[PDB]
Amino acid sequence: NSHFEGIDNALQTLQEYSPLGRSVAVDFGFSIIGGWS
């Protein structure tokens, strides 16, 4: 069963999107009531 690395690496790449060098959405809101001028 040796040469585990050939599939251990496959297991590793899965979680290879850890939060580094990446961005997430940020939301800015507003609220207005009864029309405006």
């Binding site: 069963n1 599939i7 496959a10 790449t13 899965l14 290879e16």
Partner: protein, 50 residues
């Protein structure tokens, strides 16, 4: 007296509906990336469902 097998394998015993029955979950996961491999031991086992 002798007797030949006389199609005892296919005719005298006729036929019957057969299949497999789930009994346990050997592996269950999800993955986003390259293809999938799963190497499963054949020891003391007869069939699997995928």
């Amino acid at each position: 007296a002798l007797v030949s097998l006389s199609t005892l394998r296919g005719a005298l015993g006729g036929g019957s509906i057969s299949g497999i029955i789930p009994q346990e979950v050997l592996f269950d996961q999800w993955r986003a990336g390259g293809n999938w491999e799963v190497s499963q031991s054949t020891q003391n086992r007869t069939g699997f469902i995928v």
